[PDB]
Amino acid sequence: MREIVHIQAGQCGNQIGAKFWEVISDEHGIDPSGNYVGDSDLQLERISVYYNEASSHKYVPRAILVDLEPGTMDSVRSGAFGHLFRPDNFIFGQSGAGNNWAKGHYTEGAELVDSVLDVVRKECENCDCLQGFQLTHSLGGGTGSGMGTLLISKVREEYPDRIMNTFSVVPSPKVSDTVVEPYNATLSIHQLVENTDETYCIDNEALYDICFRTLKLATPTYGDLNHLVSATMSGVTTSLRFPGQLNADLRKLAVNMVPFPRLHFFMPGFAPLTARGSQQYRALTVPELTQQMFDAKNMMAACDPRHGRYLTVATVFRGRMSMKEVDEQMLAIQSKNSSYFVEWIPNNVKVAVCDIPPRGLKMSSTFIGNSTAIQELFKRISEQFTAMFRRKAFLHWYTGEGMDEMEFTEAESNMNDLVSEYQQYQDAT
Amino acid sequence: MREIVHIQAGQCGNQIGAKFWEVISDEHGIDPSGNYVGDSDLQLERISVYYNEASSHKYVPRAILVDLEPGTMDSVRSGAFGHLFRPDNFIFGQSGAGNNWAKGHYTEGAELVDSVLDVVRKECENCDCLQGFQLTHSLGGGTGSGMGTLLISKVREEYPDRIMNTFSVVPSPKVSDTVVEPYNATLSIHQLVENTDETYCIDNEALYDICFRTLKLATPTYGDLNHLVSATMSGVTTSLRFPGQLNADLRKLAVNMVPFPRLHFFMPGFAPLTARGSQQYRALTVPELTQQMFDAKNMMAACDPRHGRYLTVATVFRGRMSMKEVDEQMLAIQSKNSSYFVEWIPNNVKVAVCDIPPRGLKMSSTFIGNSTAIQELFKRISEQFTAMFRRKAFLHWYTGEGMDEMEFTEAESNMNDLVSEYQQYQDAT
Amino acid sequence: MRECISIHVGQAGVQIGNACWELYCLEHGIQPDGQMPHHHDSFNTFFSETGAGKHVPRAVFVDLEPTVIDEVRTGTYRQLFHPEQLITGKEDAANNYARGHYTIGKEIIDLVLDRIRKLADQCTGLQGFLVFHSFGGGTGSGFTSLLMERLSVDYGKKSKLEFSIYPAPQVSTAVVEPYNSILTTHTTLEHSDCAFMVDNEAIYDICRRNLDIERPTYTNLNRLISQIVSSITASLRFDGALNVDLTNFQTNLVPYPRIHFPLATYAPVISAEKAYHEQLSVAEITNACFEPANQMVKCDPRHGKYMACCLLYRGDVVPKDVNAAIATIKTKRSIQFVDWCPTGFKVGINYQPPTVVPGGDLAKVQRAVCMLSNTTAIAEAWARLDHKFDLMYAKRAFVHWYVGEGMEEGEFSEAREDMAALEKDYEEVGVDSVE
Amino acid sequence: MRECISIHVGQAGVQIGNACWELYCLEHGIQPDGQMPHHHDSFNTFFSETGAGKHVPRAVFVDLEPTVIDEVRTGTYRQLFHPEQLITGKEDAANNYARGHYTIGKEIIDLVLDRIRKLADQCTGLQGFLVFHSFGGGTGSGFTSLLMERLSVDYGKKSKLEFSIYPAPQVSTAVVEPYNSILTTHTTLEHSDCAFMVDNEAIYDICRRNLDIERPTYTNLNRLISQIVSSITASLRFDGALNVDLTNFQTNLVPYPRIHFPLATYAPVISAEKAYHEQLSVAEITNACFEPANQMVKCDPRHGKYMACCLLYRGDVVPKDVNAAIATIKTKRSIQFVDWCPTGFKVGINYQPPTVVPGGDLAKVQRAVCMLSNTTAIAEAWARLDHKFDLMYAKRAFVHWYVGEGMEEGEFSEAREDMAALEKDYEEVGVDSVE
Ligand SMILES: Nc1nc2c(ncn2[C@@H]2O[C@H](COP(=O)(O)OP(=O)(O)OP(=O)(O)O)[C@@H](O)[C@H]2O)c(=O)[nH]1
Ligand SMILES: Nc1nc2c(ncn2[C@@H]2O[C@H](COP(=O)(O)OP(=O)(O)OP(=O)(O)O)[C@@H](O)[C@H]2O)c(=O)[nH]1
Ligand SMILES: Nc1nc2c(ncn2[C@@H]2O[C@H](COP(=O)(O)OP(=O)(O)OP(=O)(O)O)[C@@H](O)[C@H]2O)c(=O)[nH]1
Ligand SMILES: Nc1nc2c(ncn2[C@@H]2O[C@H](COP(=O)(O)OP(=O)(O)OP(=O)(O)O)[C@@H](O)[C@H]2O)c(=O)[nH]1
Ligand SMILES: [Mg+2]
Ligand SMILES: [Mg+2]
Ligand SMILES: [Mg+2]
Ligand SMILES: [Mg+2]
Incomplete structure (x- = not known):
């Protein structure tokens, strides 16, 4: 099935x-x-x-x-x-x-x-x-x-x-x-x-x-x-x-x-993450779960959403909980953290709830956010690639097994076009 | 009896x-x-x-x-x-x-x-x-x-x-x-x-x-x-x-x-064929047996069927099995592989079921398909015989025990006639 | 059941046969005295059993001089041979083809034939003859050519295989080899099913380089010869997964009535201390046997084409890797077949590993490969030898010894043109032709 | 499964190979005679398995003079090596590249090529060649040139790694050293994927300071170089948290067709009494390895710029602290990379700690680092060698010897211009350029 x-x-x-x-x-x-x-x-x-x-x-x-x-x-x-x-x-x-x-x-x-x-x-x-x-x-x-x-x-x-x-x-x-x-x-x-x-x-x-x-x-x-x-x-x-x-x-x-065909690069995250010693000094509950999810320090991709806007967000919870607290508190998140959310997607929110908890824990949660903070990663990679390629280093063995220069040119052009579209869609009105 | x-x-x-x-x-x-x-x-x-x-x-x-x-x-x-x-x-x-x-x-x-x-x-x-x-x-x-x-x-x-x-x-x-x-x-x-x-x-x-x-x-x-x-x-x-x-x-x-008296050259085939260690990881059932029959990898005659079309096919199942699976899948084989079957013999499939499993196995089946891929087997043999006979190599030891060059005229001609009719039936309409 | 007799003539044949029959008793577990300490027939094709527990060989030792046969009687293999077969004359032929073919050959040819019909009737399913004769000598060339006429008429269509000793190009024991060789080949060209060629100078390189022995006496050299001899008949005496009989090679290696001159080869040939550091696998001995430095005739195959081939494995051999190893040989370009021979290999397998005689140069081995390739590389052997003889006949050197002993000058011309005809046909067939 | 073969040329090559194969024998737990008492494949990369429990190396020892090969035969490793590969001529080239490349070098090159082909066809997934040769030695340089040409002709695109012996600036043992160096470098500039450099004076400084040994015989230097070789090869020979291969080494170190001259370094190199008073942490051994006083080529990278770096850590290792040490060394001031290489680091990790030989100068360690750096500090060494060669050649010294042994003047002129161009390109690429 x-x-x-x-x-x-x-x-x-x-x-x-x-x-x-x-x-x-x-x-x-x-x-x-x-x-x-x-x-x-x-x-x-x-x-x-x-x-x-x-x-x-x-x-x-x-x-x-x-x-x-x-x-x-x-x-x-x-x-x-x-x-x-x-x-x-x-x-x-x-x-x-x-x-x-x-x-x-x-x-x-x-x-x-x-x-x-x-x-x-x-x-x-x-x-x-x-x-x-x-x-x-x-x-x-x-x-x-x-x-x-x-x-x-x-x-x-x-x-x-x-x-x-x-x-x-x-x-x-x-x-x-x-x-x-x-x-x-x-x-x-x-x-x-x-x-x-x-x-x-x-x-x-x-x-x-x-x-x-x-x-x-x-x-x-x-x-x-x-x-x-x-x-x-x-x-x-x-x-x-x-x-x-x-x-x-x-x-x-x-x-x-995926609101658009070329924009499908995500950023994951998981909560809670507690040491074996410091696990008995915190009560596991939806507020701390959501708050720990929505702080950059607990982000699994090396990017800081403070420099961007959450285009869309999914929260897949686990364990046994109640949609009341889940929603009302992610609502509190939306209200408090409004400045970092896009304006032309009202209700940029998806939430799902499972029933079986993760092994050895009362309840957990997984975050999946599509943001515009990946733009810095793409542009940094672009800068490194364009420098190393304008030096034309390491190039002639990529050429030596089938490729040549116009493929690199077209790849750089396509990636730069994607970066430009990503930025101009972040900065839309 | x-x-x-x-x-x-x-x-x-x-x-x-x-x-x-x-x-x-x-x-x-x-x-x-x-x-x-x-x-x-x-x-x-x-x-x-x-x-x-x-x-x-x-x-x-x-x-x-x-x-x-x-x-x-x-x-x-x-x-x-x-x-x-x-x-x-x-x-x-x-x-x-x-x-x-x-x-x-x-x-x-x-x-x-x-x-x-x-x-x-x-x-x-x-x-x-x-x-x-x-x-x-x-x-x-x-x-x-x-x-x-x-x-x-x-x-x-x-x-x-x-x-x-x-x-x-x-x-x-x-x-x-x-x-x-x-x-x-x-x-x-x-x-x-x-x-x-x-x-x-x-x-x-x-x-x-x-x-x-x-x-x-x-x-x-x-x-x-x-x-x-x-x-x-x-x-x-x-x-x-x-x-x-x-x-x-x-x-x-x-x-x-045997639709014609001169066409009775077949291609056998057996299934399943599993090693002594890689058999516990595969569940034996009717689906894969028919799938294992029709791939060119598992056939006992070194001739690729992809270059030809099956004229007729006979499968002799064994073991204990419900008949529905035996025949519901030979429609899928006929449907999925519709390009590898001759057109002027609709329903060119024969099936038969026994009731005793082979020793040490739960069920098995045997495939005997009169295909036209034999066409390439006779061309190659007749090709080698064509060049060798031209120089009369090794011939001076056949003529000395009754035979003659007159005998070899019929063998090549009858083969050349037979391999031609074995092919223009495939191309017939 | 199917029986073959061996005719050993001259000190070449007798010395080879002394070590040749040394090997068979080891293979069949026969004590030199005839007693005993696959099995149970094995020896029934060679060792005709007598009334007692003794087994006697089926050999016909014949020579003109009584010298070489004397130590055979007085050697350690005295009781094994039946005392009647050791036929001896009184004086040799002195490297004179005429003496051993017209003058003293006839006065003794009627005695060897008597022992042939005596032994041919003793056996039931007689298959063919094995001949062990050289070319340079007199009793080994003129006398054995008389036999080829005598056995052919007595027995119409049977196997006639010769294990010759080809004279070496550079190495030259005698001085009248170009006279003996051409006279022998012309007469025995039409009376031989197939003649395996062995050169004497080639075995020095095999023993010096491959086996690394600095003192290769004839005892050690003749040991390397009996291995192929015991290999050709290794399927009659033992059961294998794919058997071959003496008519198989006779049918597989003779594309034309004249072109029936193959050349032997053996593998593996490695030393004793080097045995511990060798893997000795089926994949390599196929390549090891085929390398041009391992053939037993000083003619590199790279100069010509392989007319056909034949392989006889033995021991713990699996027929897949034999199929695999042989298949990749066609891809490698040190081999070169003729166009009209798309299939040009024959494979035979056996279940008996080879056994090494104690005190020998070889080491114990679990596999063996014995290749017999008819190839165009032997064409240079006739042409090079034909040049030497053509130089002699220009000023008629040494002729007066031949003419006065019962031959004519006209007979010499016929043997000269016959080698030209064989060389022309063999090269013309070997070389490509239009249409 | 991935097979690499080692060719040892010259006396230096033979001694270094003796040490290296000793170290391999201790590493894989094999006795010198071939028997044995992660582990078992590993040894299948080097030690080909024979019929019995013995294993034999894939080494090809080749030399002209027979004395050193006689020594290695008489050494304690007499049973391990396969006796056929130990190829010896009769007389050495006597520090004459002309003799080692043209006159005598062509009479043994056929045999060494035959053995190379035999071994390469014996294996299945051949990876490449490791050539252990010196530069001053006439036979070493001549056979290096000849074997590079022959192997490049035979096998098209495989890995060819060299472990050279760079001539020392102040330490010197030859007079035709500049001539040998210029000729071999010009000849093998275009026929090698990646050539490492090792100098004897640098190793002597390392052994004097870091290890504090007053009597540094050649055994200790050979032990060190063998340790670097084993460290670079342990990636293929063993499993780790992050594996790396020879193709990885090439594609991460050499960026250009000509600029493929890295240099090696090893860490930690500390004595036995100083072992107890040290911590041996990942960060400290990384800093020690990057320390300019530990490099094994007499050229201080402070005069130049690093261009590419590869480090293999082996033993118990944590990638987090590896990352921290790499980041802090990247952010350090004195180490300076090139502008067009924002990422100039390649890290590999192996789960097998190094094992110390018995009686060795080093001490047991749980963590080891091998570093291979392609930098521009080799340009000064190239310039110094070129200046020495030009000064010597300005008045045509020993040119009579070289010309009499089948040479001309165009070879010298073209080698000079070729290394001038190579040094110019090396400096131009290494130096920073606008845009
Ligand atoms: N392979 C091998 N060849 C031998 C041996 N002994 C002699 N020959 C060859 O025999 C040749 C001599 O001619 P033979 O036919 O043996 O002469 P013969 O047998 O003494 O008879 P006569 O010619 O009458 O003296 C030499 O050229 C050798 O090449 C041997 O022990 N082994
Ligand atoms: N599938 C299979 N084929 C075999 C086997 N053994 C032999 N063959 C085939 O049998 C062929 C030999 O021809 P046969 O008719 O058996 O020859 P023979 O029975 O030894 O007698 P001759 O025809 O006189 O040689 C070979 O080409 C093999 O391909 C076997 O065990 N399995
Ligand atoms: N690292 C190291 N280098 C060595 C050792 N022994 C010799 N060398 C170097 O090898 C050089 C001598 O050249 P070789 O290749 O040995 O010359 P050869 O073996 O005598 O043969 P020819 O060149 O023909 O004279 C010297 O300049 C040394 O620098 C050693 O044990 N370790
Ligand atoms: N998250 C995570 N990344 C890893 C791990 N191991 C390796 N990597 C990453 O994988 C990369 C190595 O690329 P691979 O595709 O695995 O290279 P390979 O498998 O050795 O084969 P090649 O691509 O041919 O070099 C490194 O840059 C690491 O960042 C791991 O255990 N966890
Ligand atoms: Mg005699
Ligand atoms: Mg048969
Ligand atoms: Mg020397
Ligand atoms: Mg990989």
Whole structure:
């Protein structure tokens, strides 16, 4: 019922997926062996949205793990939670793209997308009513970025009447993990802009700040970072995974938050985030949940909404609560924080309520805001790319495997046009 | 009741039959010693089709094993599972045919053929109502191709009102086991298309691809390659050996599959084919079995069906299954793949259901489709024979044993005529 | 059951046969005295069983001089051979083709034929003959050419295989090799189903380079020869997943009645200390056997085309990688086939791993490859040898020894033009032709 | 699964390779004789597995003089290496690039190419070549040129990484050193993806100051360079929180077709008695690695600008503190990057802590950092070498030797002009420019 397919690309994709399926197995009470061991029947009432049933009451994730380098697959196969995936899903190449868009989009891309499209067509056969696609990847690496672009284009070609959500790990503004980010970022951004539905931009240094300050962790690792990202994603999907007083789903979110075809870049957030020690000194309640959601410090993207205006906002709550407090207090938010809301969208508000709380907590909430503060991120990336390209550095190996200069020119022009439209729509009357 | 006699010519036939009569014993619960030790009584209600009852409840196969060289019998006679054959059946000659057509059809095989016809006529003077003959020969060697063709013409005379099915092993396109393949192949087909009812063309590396890719085996020996040809062989004749909701038999397939006397070259296929570790992660049900049939990856003849159109298709299901799924999906196959079916045979599908599952599996099915993709198989063989004969290579060793250049004129011309009519029917309207 | 007899003539054949029959008893577990300590026939095609537990070979040792046969009688293999077969004359032929073919050949040719019909009737399913004769010598060239006339008439159409010893281009033991070779080839061209060529200078390079031995005596060199000899008949004596008989190669490697001159090759050939550091896989020994530095005739195949091929594996061999390894050879461009031979390979497999004789140079091995490729590279061997003989006949050197012993000057001209005809036909067929 | 092969040229190459393969043997837990008592693939990247439990390296030792190869044969690593690869000529080039590239170099290059082809066809997913060679050595430079040309001709687009031995400015052991350097650099400028530089005087300064050893034999220097090699390769050889490959190294370090001359650095390098009184934190080891007194090329980056940097951390590591240290070093004043490279950092992390050899000069560590910097401080070294070569050549010294060994004057002139242009382009790119 409303089947959804998960696609993971690059090392980030595989790691985030491992943590995410950890979260899903814990939520639905699935043993690492693959056999149900829980007690509640509400979880099994709707178990087939992500998992698939198999003989001897086994459950197999609808996962498509694929990466050019085989190290990530070797790690995930040798480690725990490798006994429930189906081996046919595990696609791996011969060598990583080496942080090269050309190698990730033209050289191994052909064969790899052929194989992965065959696997996708096999997977979509079992689905009863396909709902949409999920793709978690990074815009910084080569294989994940370029091959995810090619896969997205071909999947859009095959399935026009369907939606896909992309969880992109945007490169951090303050620090760069690699050297040549801007070329890859600009090319992937242009391709996504032309051929995607919605994008939940997630940053890395903002999540570092969130994990250090709010959660008070001395040495946070990628395990904790991916834990938080997986929690956000599970909170997003629980709306149609679980019953609730006021339900919502992916198409509802998309129609509520894409007012224009070229404006679908979002900013997520999660609440509450409390340390193990400081959890007993605060009473969990809707006021502090909403107030913690609506402060920039608890924003998962490295941008400050104080410099922009919330174009639209979605709040997906969980646990058991009451719409009275939910609405009356988000109303208080709208009244108090009016100056940071757009004027030509009266009632720029969407709220949904689930019924099953997150594990080990009374109630939580997920925020998804479409704002104009991503404009600074796009313009900073544009500045870096235009400087590095006017020097013409690193260019002749992007040229050496298929590309040439006019593609870079057109990508820069398209991205700049998007920036200009974003700004002039923020500053409309 | 409805008796059948099984013949094995050449080295392959004695090797294919070494495992063919292994699965039949397992199906009917027959010990290697020859004494029934089974429990279910549904096996013995029709046990006389293949096995022959003798004194003291000992059953002996109704098959004859023959070769010109004595190396093959010494393996099966001295080895295990050789206690159940009757020693009179083991006909062997003096020396091998040496990969020569003439030595297997005129010079050396003429002496032994009188020693095997007198066994065939003796073979079922006790057979109540003969259904037909099963022939398991090869098209590459001399004894299997040469005399096995001579045996067909002699058997055709004594039993004209009967059917025979040849489970031939047509030579491979990429690799040749012997240098002089095209001479033996073309000289054999010229007499096959005259006095045989139906033919199962099988390649060797087509089994290599299936075993390596689908079954995930790294070192497939002939013990495992021939074990899959046995499964297809048992599936075709399981309809008249066991009860079924919709029964068929060997005479039913021939009329449904041979629209014209010169067109009886088929393409077998089996499903499911799952490894020993990747089977717990897949639930066996009717949907994927039909899907696994029609993809070019899983077919036992190395010929891509995408370049041709199916003329007729017959699927022989097994196991226990509701019929609705069996036929509701062959409409979807006919609808989704409507471009791969001939137009002037509406409803070109034959189906049949048995009621006994294959050992160790919940259900399975067998596909036998008379396609037009055989067109490319005969072009390639006739192409190799065209260039080789022009230089008269290896010819000076065929003319010395009865044949002449006049004989080769008919073989190429009849092949060229046959392959043309095998094609212009596809292009007909 | 299907029987083949071996004719060993000259000190070349006898010395080869001394180590050749050394290997068969090791393969079949036969003690030198005939006692015993797949199995149970194995030896029935070579070892004709007698009344007692002894097994006697089916060999016909023949020579003109009584020298080389003497140590065979007095060697460690004294009881095994049946004392009657060791036919010996009184004096040799002295590298004279005329002496061994007209004068002293006839006075003893009637004695060897008597032991042939004696042994041919003793067997039931006789298949063919194995000949172990050289070219340079007199009793190994003139005398064996007499046999080829005698066995051909007595037995019309049977297998006639020769394991010759090709004279080396640079290495030259004798001084009248160009006279003996051309006279031998012309007479035995039409009386041989197939003749495996072996050169003496080629085996030095194999032993010096591949095996790394600095003292390659004839004991070690002849050991490398019996391995191919035991390889050609390795399918008759043992059961394999894909068997081959002596008519298979005879049918697969002879596109024309005249072009029946293949050349042997063996693999793997590696040392003892180097064994521990080698993987020894099916994929590499196919490449190792095919490299031009491993053939046993000093003729690099790169100069010509491969007319045909034939492979006989054994041991723990799986027929898939054999299919895989052979398939990729056609892609590699050190091989070059003829246009009218799109399919040009033959594969045979066996279930018996090769066994190394104790004290030998080779090491224990689980796989073996023995390639027999008829190729155009042997065309240069005849032309180069034909140049040497044509230089002799210009001033009629050494001729007076031949003419006075029972041959005519006209017979020399016929053998000269015959090699020109063979060289012309072999090159013309090997080279491409219009239409 | 991704296979890289190592070619060691010259005496320096052989000794460095001995140390490097020793370090690999301790790293993968393999005994010297091939047996063994994250882990098991790893060793499949280097150690090809034979039939038994033994593993053999993928090394190709090549030299002209036989003395050092005899030493490595007689060393304790006599069973591990496959005896065939140890290719030796008969006489050395004697510090003559002409001899090492034209006269004798062509008589052994065929054998080394044959062995390279054999090993490369043996593997499956070949990655690239690592060449360990010196610059002063005549055989080293000549074989470097010849092997670069041959490998570039044979294999089109693969990784070719070099670990050179840069000539020291003040420390000197040769007289034809400028000639060898100019010729080899001109020849291999266009035939190498990324060439690292190591200098002996810099390593001596490091060992004197940081480690405080008064008797620094070549063993300690070789140990250091082997440690850098193992650190750069541990990314392929092991799994980590963020992996990096050789193609990543190239695409993140070298920005231009010619400017591909980085330099290596290792940290921490501290003694044994000083180990107890130190904390060994991520930030402090990062600062020590970026400290200009730890670089292994005698050129202080204060005279130039950093252009690209790659750092591999191995052991227990937190990406947050890695990020903090990188950010603070980026914001520090003394380190200065180029304007057109706003992001000049590439970080990799590995979960395997380094292992110290027994009896080594270094101490056990839980965190290690390897740094590879492409900067403009190498321009001064290029200019100094060019000035030395021009001063020596201004009056035609040793030119009679070089010309007599098959050379001309155009080669010298074109090498001079080529390095002049290369230095000019290097300085122009490194220096800041308006717009
Ligand atoms: N949030 C998060 N990001 C990660 C994690 N691991 C890696 N990344 C990001 O992923 C980027 C690396 O790009 P990838 O596509 O994974 O590169 P790769 O998988 O090594 O293969 P190539 O693209 O060919 O280099 C880095 O810039 C990181 O910012 C992680 O655990 N969590
Ligand atoms: N599928 C399959 N084919 C086999 C097997 N063994 C042999 N063959 C085929 O059989 C062919 C050999 O021809 P045969 O007619 O058997 O030759 P023979 O029986 O040995 O006797 P001759 O014809 O005289 O050589 C080869 O081309 C193989 O392709 C097997 O185990 N499985
Ligand atoms: N491979 C091999 N060849 C040998 C051996 N001994 C001799 N030969 C070859 O035999 C040639 C000599 O001619 P033979 O036919 O043996 O002469 P013969 O057998 O003594 O007979 P006569 O010519 O009458 O003396 C030499 O050129 C050698 O090449 C051997 O032990 N092994
Ligand atoms: N790092 C390091 N460098 C060395 C070592 N041994 C020698 N070298 C360098 O190698 C140079 C000598 O050149 P080689 O390549 O060894 O010359 P060769 O091996 O004698 O052979 P020829 O060049 O023909 O004379 C010296 O200038 C040293 O700088 C060593 O153990 N470690
Ligand atoms: Mg990667
Ligand atoms: Mg046979
Ligand atoms: Mg003699
Ligand atoms: Mg030297």
